[PDB]
Design a protein around this ligand. Structure first.
Ligand SMILES: Nc1ncnc2c1ncn2[C@@H]1O[C@@H]2COP(=O)(O)O[C@@H]3[C@@H](COP(=O)(O)O[C@H]2[C@H]1F)C[C@@H](n1cnc2c(=O)nc[nH]c21)[C@@H]3O
Lengths: 171, 172
């Protein structure tokens, strides 16, 4: 439980509380030069996190990067926070466009189950993944920086593009 | 023991990725002298300023290393950047290296402040010790960080610049 709890908090403290307040302005700026205002975070419960979303689903195609968000942190000058805009295809048709990405800490949990000295059983990978999401949901429920700007897509495995499309058309 | 996961996230998410490409990047900057190893500051009090110059006037930012980019977790060209600092001693340039704090220690400090995090503010020091000890063990058996980085663990009562120079000069 400790590992998932910490990663969820590091995900919020290190990433979400920093970019969510500035997310809306960045999205408007791209729209000015080209529900979609929300960050959609994929949470595969099996911790399978491909680095390329297109490999996960051909209907998910990279479109363009958002304007970069930079800031000095932990002695590193101009640390860059960037997000990628994806389009969702349905029967060859362009069904939507949104900022889509996986939750990277799930990728860390997968690796811990592989490395021996981590002492992390592969069975616990699913367990800590569930705890990570539930902890993340609780943080964002009371998070002030999150006001209709972040949605979590939790799933266990099918069409990944359809799953994201379901949440887009749901609201 | 929250620090155990943070040490693994620090290695898996950052160190195993940038360290293998670190020496190549340092070569590019030298041609286009900087030490070949990444120095990670580990203040055990979890005090992590964002501006290293504020921590010590003798630590002066010089220039950024060439950026490292790669698609990660669905984000195209996620940027990994590092800063090169100059270490001053009695007005003299005593060394140059890639220097940065260990960000997870900053996260440990922030966790203690949040009430729903369930992290006591008195456990900051021991979790920092646990973070260093776990990270030290990870790097000990990891060939990825084969002398491509060295940890600088310290506890303030001070000259941070002198602390780095001691490790920096030992490598000479
Ligand atoms: N720009 C960004 N873009 C996307 N997503 C980001 C993000 N910045 C944060 N996130 C998200 O927030 C989580 C916790 O962030 P943080 O608390 O900063 O801990 C990081 C550790 C765990 O990285 P991991 O990728 O597993 O999980 C991240 C990720 F999900 C590894 C270290 N790290 C990583 N990259 C760097 C770097 O370029 N320069 C210095 N240090 C670095 C930090 O210590």
């Amino acid at each position: 439980f400790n590992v998932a709890h910490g990663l969820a908090w590091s995900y919020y403290i290190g990433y979400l509380r920093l970019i969510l307040p500035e997310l809306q302005a960045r999205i408007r700026t791209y729209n000015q030069h080209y529900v979609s205002q929300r960050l959609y975070i994929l949470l595969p419960l099996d911790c399978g996190v491909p680095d390329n979303l297109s490999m996960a689903d051909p209907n998910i195609r990279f479109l363009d990067k958002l304007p970069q968000q930079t800031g000095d942190r932990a002695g590193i000058k101009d640390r860059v926070y960037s997000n990628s805009i994806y389009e969702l295809l349905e029967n060859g048709q362009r069904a939507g466009t949104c900022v889509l990405e996986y939750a990277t800490p799930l990728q860390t949990l997968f690796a811990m189950s592989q490395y021996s000295q981590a002492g992390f059983s592969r069975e616990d990978r699913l367990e800590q993944a569930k705890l990570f999401c539930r902890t993340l949901e609780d943080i964002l429920a009371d998070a002030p920086e999150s006001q209709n700007n972040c949605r979590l897509i939790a799933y266990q495995e099918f069409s990944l593009s359809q799953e994201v499309l379901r949440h887009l058309r749901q609201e």
